[PDB]
Point group: D2
Chain length 454, copies 4
């Protein structure tokens, strides 16, 4: 039973991981498993690797701003952080349930889709077992190249600088290898102005109740978007604020269901990463477009049906749609936001989305998705180590970015996780392949040491 | 297009119906249909029958105390008040939806089970078309035999006395024929005492909010029973009073699902009334017991699953069941109720139901079903017209009760509706056969007149 | 109760309909209903219109080549040929079931989706009531303009010439107004050669058993396509020929589910035809593309799941996919068909569909859809009556094609049905709006006469 | 990684298990797991126990006579032979799928209910890992008491005699402890005569095709019963013999659905065995009756719906039920079977089951369940070791039968498995608690040795 011990800050690490979300957690789990002589017989002959995870949050949390009450996983629990790699792992969802005394009780639900609350707790339970090698409240701000021989022209380590979120102090740690697994940042439409009453979906549960404190007051609340987050928020607002008037604004004509049909869904199989990666740029782009309805701007059928039913019940009570407490406004775009008025309410102007009315609202929830380019800011000072004229980070199949072999030692490298959809497929940003990917990553990074034991 | 005109109070009626609930409404609809030359070609040759319906409520309503938000019909909309007799009828659910401008919208729900709110409105829409022949706010208090020749020993009419619910005045109407369609009365366990805080399920929506006025207060509310009403209330309380502590008390070990499987469910077919009626007393009793799970002490599967899921989510948050906000207490019976205390809360003592704890609650909802014997109080003064030594009303196949042929003229009679489960089957008290039964009833009562036209 | 009587062949008709499929049948039903004084009170004052339907089949049939055993409707039974226009109509699906003694039995299925076999019989039952005004075994071959004054330059009638399918004789009928409701013709890929062993899906049930007579023989049968017809055939072959080796060839990567989600599905509402028609050419094209997954190249989820399950069971028995009895070959196109060999089997050559193997098969089923341009062949001799320079038939909102007002009298006209997707929407070729459309069509064609009664 | 080695026939065993079905297999798995130092840290200090399993079949098989094509498990795969005891076990269903290369593929089915074919293979894969300690083709015929000191009056071992199914030779093995896990024997109604054409459901797949060799011939085949086996066979016959005329005979009025609702289903939780066992004889009997619909004379809802649908399709084709190819004959009992006729068909006489027709059939399938009393025949010679006057085997909570402490040494004992419903609950004969029970059994039998290591 291996327990990963901490490395002193001042020592050269074998690996430093930026972020301790699901993607990094799955690597921590895979490494534990690779070192467990109960699962990997060769691990009897294997000194502990010097590893550290840096996480900006104060403790493990999973999209806490969107832990909407009643919200469910959109993925089978079998695709947890260990099972698809090894069902014998102690880090499986079912083993978690066993450890909690809930296994028989979950079984009686006959569901593959746990509440997001439950799956977060599963990952929290997993994450707590690595507390000795994780530094929370640490926001990585840059990765700097290092040379053990400064007079040479070869880079063989990296310095990772992080800011303490409480004290603001900068700490440095040196490592041979870096993983960047920082997820995404809130995507806001460029046309919207900054305002406390305009809030991205990622901050829904955490910041909206601070703005609208009275759950009984008749607030007007708009929601922009038509994907899963938009539908979840729109539906939740009606429960959370029973006397409110909610409006869903979308440029599309309707909410559309996610495609989870079994043949299409095979694009998410771990085996398929090889097939997707080995295609051309054009084929990968075309494939992404063809399968878009599996993940992007789509809503789970069950939720669409529930919302539609709520709308129909409003029709039963009142045939005049303009008098409905909760409304959906399709094929529309925001053209102007008035937010300097002495009123508590902003004034939102709407036009057709085809190439109209005015709304007075207390808050606008913006469910417009994420960008996954934040790693570029962290890596700006290592850009010069890329091969000449390359202005994009190119991840290999094993997620290690390409660098000039004559500038960077074979012992040093940087891996990207969760931002590689374009090269690795639609499963990249999701939970789908994390168990298997974690195992691949451990092989890629710690292969040499693991072979000496093997 | 026939429109039933009112009969003056002082005139001898052909028919007087006690109650204007679903059962009487289906008779009104069938009579309209029988007189509609568009549906019944013979009706061209057919004077209007002198008819009146007496209803104690101020206006049409359908189990208003149990119009729980979100509650659904447990029966296909095809089994409405007309369709199974004639799909061409203007009183079909689909024609109602067409008249309302909702037909296409309902179609898009892909559901056979409308909200109870919607189905009530359907029946209200139907009922409003008979407002000229219905006297609301009139509670029938007795049915008295009458003799057009008082010196004779033959009864040939009945006087129906009703009390105005507002003024308390007694009005009489004389009729040749009487229908009693008064549904059921609240069944309370004999062991429980009378108290404003102890309320039958039938009075849930109408009287509980008057008792517990603050929807935010942390009330303790118990629910007794394990049938559909108990589950509906238990589930609704958690929505209506978010900070409340609810407890479901049942003598059974678990909530059990209603059987709606297709072969068993055929007992509800209109054709099957003939088969059920023609069996012996023992066979009818045995059949009722064998099929009990179709109607009695059962909960719709979907609702059991929802409640169970809510319970599991409580387990996720807290593994200690005694700390759960909402609890179910199986295999238990109330033995004592303390309700004279200076406290606002009653003290409910519990023991095992096999041949324990104490609860402090602000209200006890009692979901213990209905009796259907209230017609006996109304008919006590006509009992002597039954054949000698008969101490039970015996309905024929056509629902007309047996009377001594030498005491009662062939032109006079009394019909029972909705209280005949023992002779007619499990569909008797339900909506299942009302369309067809209404048609049979019109034939039984108005056959002679309808034949002259035929 | 109106019964449409036949018009002698030699008389000038008010209307002549080409085709007696669902679209023409819905017009016949609407006309009956408009003339029924039981449904339309004004019809008491209304001489019978002189009408005739010409149908090339020997008797009413509905896609008989695709009456696959077990195949189901993809549309709610509420969207039958009358209900959405008038639920009181005797031509509703529910009234049909009542007339058949099956209403209670269908109700117990709890399904909105009847077997295609059942829905065909419903339409057959409807169609048989118009046998006096339908000429079967008559294939319309041309529509010719006529002038009651031949020296004038104004057209005021049309001659319809039809070929007797048995005798080959040409018959003519003259009418003021023509409806063309001829559905679609089999679409075959241009690259495939003509061969008795290459059969379009439309001829599956009728012609394939004549080719492959022994249901026990181990035939190799390929299926080309990935829409509903392809999946239905692929699945059925495995039942019909238990020892056969079936192959599904598709250029797409996977079978994709049809979108029947409630918000998107509203594009099929009758009310929406007005909204769709009133858009620009670009907006209509964009809208058609956006909603394509509702109808084109899609398979019902349930069927995809069944086929996938069958595939998984093959995996259980044998992990080597190349040995599977039934296989799916995605992302492939046929490049060559060898069919001159002394062998009973054709040789099908396959390549990637991205811009491989060889199959030896006894039959190739081609499920590649339909064209709806066959009306152009029938109307070639009336093209000159279109406004100058117009080389496309332009249907108005009411389906009447545009003609030069100075060449064609106001009393004469031609209507198109079922080929108008581009102007009227995705519901045009389907059953979705037929009841309502039939009513609109009767108003458009017989408005003048119906107003005199009104 | 422990591998159980064989014990020579002539050595005194620690344990001898009669039967190698699911129940014994779960004990073998639990013992392996208890000895696995990877799962049980104490097992590092633990000589191998001398164990042997005797199985009458030639190789592992699971109800092979009822491996009906398409038949599914009625239990969640989580309730496999290891998971509920330890999800880390290599004997879990998911680990089996991983070892087979099918884990991702099963995941994509979104089902908790594998095909019986698949679950048998899972158990076969498990069973093959114990081939060194299992003797197949050995039918145990008696258990005889033994005394290491024959002049003493204390029994301290047992001799198990088994017959080789091929050679007929009797072999003996001596053991301290015996487990009897022999499942059930076919229950036939006493009124039916012996005939090759009258076959119990347990022999359906294995022996019926030998009798009715021509799958195309129009055989008449009757099925008696109304539980899961009856429905499965009735449905399968229609597929297997497409031209046959099948009849389902039942004494009940209808097929009834199994209750798998979540609250009731908790009776199957492993924890609940303690609660059930600790009740009185009357309470246990009453509890068994109350929950009967979970297991006995019930059919999975989905299958009832399918069969009902098939019946409705027959109604569509022909409204005359007496002409239906496949029929159900409710509320009936067989009174006479004529089977001496020169005809190939037997003549079955039917009467009402309430306290009729004749059928001519080629075969009668009898789906009338199992008895679980066969252990009494094997134990007749050890009956005298029970406490005085005890004429029933009384299993303790830990499944060890009560014996006179002064006649039987503490080191010797006999355990019963799968025949203990009356004392242990409805989960006893099923797969529900096998993983946990296997663990309890290993503790009960090998506790002393396992503690020395602990
Ligand atoms: C509301 C919601 C629901 C979802 N549901 C599902 C689902 O059901 N199934 C599914 O497959 N996928 C789902 N997803 C997709 C989601 O991306 C993955 O579940 C998962 O979060 C990916 O993990 P990650 O580690 O790549 O990114 P994240 O989960 O975002 O984790 C990245 C971590 O890095 C930390 N970090 C960021 N920047 C820094 C820095 N500079 N220094 C230090 N630490 C930093 C962040 O605090 C965060 O903890 C969902 C996404 C959202 C938003
Ligand atoms: C909450 C609830 C939900 C149900 N849901 C369903 C369902 O989904 N499907 C189904 O098939 N069945 C259902 N039922 C069964 C129900 O009995 C029938 O739907 C229906 O109410 C039977 O109609 P009825 O006219 O016989 O009785 P009621 O509906 O009770 O109508 C009787 C009427 O008589 C009036 N009345 C009583 N006494 C007098 C008097 N002395 N003088 C004058 N008027 C009087 C009453 O005010 C009432 O209006 C439900 C029952 C309940 C309580
Ligand atoms: C297998 C299949 C299943 C389908 N299922 C559904 C469904 O579930 N729901 C749905 O909404 N839609 C469905 N459709 C769409 C289908 O187009 C409509 O159901 C319907 O057939 C449209 O009717 P129509 O009259 O426009 O065309 P058709 O049904 O093709 O009828 C046209 C008629 O015109 C006749 N005809 C053609 N040419 C001539 C001529 N020269 N002279 C005389 N007569 C002629 C033909 O014989 C035919 O009877 C399905 C289509 C197919 C192929
Ligand atoms: C068709 C069918 C389907 C079922 N499906 C399910 C399901 O989905 N879920 C569920 O929980 N339960 C199910 N059951 C219940 C079933 O009892 C259990 O799944 C399981 O078979 C119990 O295992 P067992 O070892 O107690 O008995 P068995 O499975 O009968 O095994 C007993 C073994 O002992 C052997 N044996 C018998 N006598 C002797 C002898 N004298 N000498 C040597 N060997 C002997 C037999 O050959 C057999 O291999 C099903 C039962 C049947 C019949
Ligand atoms: N299942 C019954 C109705 C039961 C109603 C229970 N409240 C039917 O089909 O008519
Ligand atoms: N429902 C039971 C299994 C019943 C099996 C019936 N053959 C369980 O969950 O364990």
């Amino acid at each position: 039973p291996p327990r990963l011990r901490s490395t002193p800050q001042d020592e050269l690490h074998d690996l430093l991981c930026v972020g301790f979300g699901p993607a990094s957690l799955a690597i921590a789990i895979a490494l534990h498993d690779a070192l467990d002589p109960r699962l990997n017989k060769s691990a009897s002959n294997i000194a502990q690797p010097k590893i550290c995870f840096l996480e900006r949050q104060k403790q493990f949390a999973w999209h806490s701003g969107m832990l909407v009450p009643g919200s469910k996983m959109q993925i089978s629990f079998i695709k947890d952080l260990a099972t698809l790699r090894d069902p014998r792992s102690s880090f499986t969802f079912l083993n978690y349930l066993h450890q909690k005394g809930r296994l028989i009780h979950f079984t009686n639900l006959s569901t593959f889709l746990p509440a997001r609350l439950e799956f977060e707790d599963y990952m929290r339970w997993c994450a707590q077992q690595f507390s000795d090698v994780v530094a929370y409240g640490e926001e990585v701000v840059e990765v700097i190249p290092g040379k053990s021989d400064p007079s040479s022209s070869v880079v063989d380590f990296f310095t990772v600088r992080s800011r303490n979120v409480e004290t603001g102090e900068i700490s440095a740690r040196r490592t041979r290898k870096v993983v960047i697994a920082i997820g995404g940042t809130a995507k806001m439409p460029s046309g919207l102005p900054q305002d406390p009453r305009i809030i991205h979906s990622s901050k829904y549960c955490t910041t909206l109740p601070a703005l609208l404190k009275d759950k009984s007051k008749p607030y007007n609340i708009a929601v922009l978007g038509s994907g899963q987050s938009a539908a979840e928020i729109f539906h939740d607002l009606q429960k959370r604020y029973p006397n409110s008037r909610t409006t869903l604004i979308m440029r599309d004509s309707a909410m559309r269901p996610s495609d989870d049909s079994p043949f299409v869904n095979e694009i998410f199989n771990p085996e398929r990463v090889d097939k997707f990666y080995s295609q051309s740029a054009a084929e990968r782009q075309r494939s992404l477009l063809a399968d878009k309805a599996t993940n992007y701007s789509v809503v789970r059928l069950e939720l669409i049906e529930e919302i539609y039913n709520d709308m129909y019940l409003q029709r039963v009570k009142n045939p005049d749609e303009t008098q409905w407490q909760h409304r959906i406004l399709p094929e529309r775009k925001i053209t102007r936001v008035e937010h300097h008025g002495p009123q508590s309410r902003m004034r939102i102007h709407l036009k057709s989305s085809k190439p109209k009315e005015t709304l007075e609202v207390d808050a606008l929830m913006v469910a417009t998705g994420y960008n996954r380019n934040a790693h570029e800011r962290l890596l700006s000072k290592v850009q010069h180590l890329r091969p000449t004229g390359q202005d994009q980070w190119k991840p290999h199949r094993d997620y290690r970015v390409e660098m000039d072999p004559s500038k960077v030692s074979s012992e040093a490298g940087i891996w990207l996780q969760g931002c590689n959809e374009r090269t690795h497929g639609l499963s990249d940003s999701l939970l789908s392949v994390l168990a298997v990917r974690g195992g691949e990553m451990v092989q890629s990074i710690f292969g040499e040491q693991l072979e000496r034991a093997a």
